[PDB]
Design an enzyme around this catalytic site. Sequence first.
Site, PDB file in Angstrom:
ATOM      1  N   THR A   1       0.634  -0.967   0.032  1.00 14.12           N
ATOM      2  CA  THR A   1      -0.050  -0.160  -0.162  1.00 14.12           C
ATOM      3  C   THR A   1       1.090   1.276   0.274  1.00 14.12           C
ATOM      4  OG1 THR A   1      -0.149   0.036   2.737  1.00 14.12           O
ATOM      5  CG2 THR A   1      -1.463  -0.693   1.053  1.00 14.12           C
TER       6      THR A   1
ATOM      7  N   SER B   1       7.831  -1.862 -21.495  1.00 16.53           N
ATOM      8  CA  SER B   1       8.280  -3.679 -21.695  1.00 16.53           C
ATOM      9  C   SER B   1       8.644  -3.984 -19.988  1.00 16.53           C
ATOM     10  CB  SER B   1       9.625  -3.251 -22.517  1.00 16.53           C
ATOM     11  OG  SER B   1       8.852  -3.289 -23.871  1.00 16.53           O
TER      12      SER B   1
ATOM     13  N   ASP C   1       7.827 -11.535 -28.427  1.00 18.24           N
ATOM     14  CA  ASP C   1       8.864 -10.696 -27.557  1.00 18.24           C
ATOM     15  C   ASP C   1       9.934 -11.545 -28.046  1.00 18.24           C
ATOM     16  OD1 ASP C   1      10.882  -9.289 -26.224  1.00 18.24           O
ATOM     17  OD2 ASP C   1       9.347  -8.878 -24.833  1.00 18.24           O
TER      18      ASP C   1
ATOM     19  N   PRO D   1      -8.983  -1.088 -27.577  1.00 16.06           N
ATOM     20  CA  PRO D   1      -9.414  -0.702 -26.072  1.00 16.06           C
ATOM     21  C   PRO D   1     -10.102  -2.707 -25.068  1.00 16.06           C
ATOM     22  CG  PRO D   1     -11.121   0.094 -27.790  1.00 16.06           C
ATOM     23  CD  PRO D   1     -10.230  -0.629 -28.520  1.00 16.06           C
TER      24      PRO D   1
ATOM     25  N   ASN E   1       6.890   3.642 -24.775  1.00 22.88           N
ATOM     26  CA  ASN E   1       7.526   4.628 -24.529  1.00 22.88           C
ATOM     27  C   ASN E   1       8.057   5.521 -25.150  1.00 22.88           C
ATOM     28  OD1 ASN E   1       8.198   2.129 -23.224  1.00 22.88           O
ATOM     29  ND2 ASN E   1       9.912   1.928 -23.801  1.00 22.88           N
TER      30      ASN E   1
ATOM     31  N   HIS F   1      15.063  -8.904 -24.493  1.00 24.03           N
ATOM     32  CA  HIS F   1      14.523  -8.702 -23.847  1.00 24.03           C
ATOM     33  C   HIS F   1      13.131  -9.418 -23.553  1.00 24.03           C
ATOM     34  CE1 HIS F   1      11.160  -6.008 -23.773  1.00 24.03           C
ATOM     35  NE2 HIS F   1      10.680  -6.270 -24.743  1.00 24.03           N
TER      36      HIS F   1
ATOM     37  N   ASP G   1      -4.987   1.086 -19.081  1.00 25.68           N
ATOM     38  CA  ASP G   1      -5.853   0.528 -17.955  1.00 25.68           C
ATOM     39  C   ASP G   1      -5.003   1.074 -16.865  1.00 25.68           C
ATOM     40  OD1 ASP G   1      -7.991  -0.676 -19.578  1.00 25.68           O
ATOM     41  OD2 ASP G   1      -6.928  -1.131 -20.655  1.00 25.68           O
TER      42      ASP G   1
ATOM     43  N   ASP H   1      -2.556   7.563  -6.353  1.00 24.12           N
ATOM     44  CA  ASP H   1      -1.296   7.383  -5.672  1.00 24.12           C
ATOM     45  C   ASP H   1       0.148   7.987  -7.015  1.00 24.12           C
ATOM     46  OD1 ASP H   1      -2.142   7.215  -2.901  1.00 24.12           O
ATOM     47  OD2 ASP H   1      -2.189   4.819  -3.893  1.00 24.12           O
TER      48      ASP H   1
HETATM   49 CA   LIG Z   1      -8.552  -0.099 -22.443  1.00 25.81          CA
END
Ligand SMILES: [Ca+2]
Length: 279
Positions: A16, A224, A39, A175, A161, A69, A200, A260
């Site tokens: 938290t 990433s 990847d 979406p 990025n 990566h 999201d 936060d």
């Molecule tokens: Ca979405």
Amino acid sequence: AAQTNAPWGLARISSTSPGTSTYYYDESAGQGSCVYVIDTGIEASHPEFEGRAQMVKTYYYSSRDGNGHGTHCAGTVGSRTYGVAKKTQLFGVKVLDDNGSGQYSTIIAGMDFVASDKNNRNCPKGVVASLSLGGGYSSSVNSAAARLQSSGVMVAVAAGNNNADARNYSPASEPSVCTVGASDRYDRRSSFSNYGSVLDIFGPGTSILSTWIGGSTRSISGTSMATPHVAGLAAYLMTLGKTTAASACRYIADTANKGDLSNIPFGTVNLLAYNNYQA
Ligand SMILES: [Ca+2]
């Protein structure tokens, strides 16, 4: 189960508050789930994977990760030391070459591959796919990500990025998949992280220690790196039962640390992935 002196991002996902260093998680640890890492590949022989990783597909002359990566991302999903879901099964799909590049047609083929391939795997607790890649807006790339999600896979994708609105990037702008921004250890939006309505969730993305090729480790930064925290979290929550592939992004948002993060632009979610584990 407590892991002391964990990478900051693991500690963050079970806290938290920022500024702690122990990762707390249910011992089930994603057992019985599977995560595809789409990847540059995964170095399956890395001791950190404990035999739980394997390459299942490549579009190039080798399935070897000659970049690092993909191995790093896989490590954040599920390595013993650096991973969120320490008992998940990891499946590598090499859609990116050793320079980290890939044609959209190959990336799309890889997504459709996963949608079918899960029917050849044992994943009784559920299936996740981590896509730490992206490029400019493409309806075809978005549609492929949408199909993968529709097929019963929790799809987590990097926001990008560019320090820009992710609406102009794919698969970030789709979406129906879970689009992941990056934060740093002081709960600031990572300086490179994309943002916007299509995001999201945020996960740890700056200075993330994980596995690397040649049986090594290193710290790198990017959306990433944030993406596999969310993918691993989904797998972990799925083996706990708490959610399903179709609902995991919503569940993660529902249960996130809220309000936060700093420097989140007006109109972007202020939500940080959190496992809500009470030891
Ligand atoms: Ca979405």
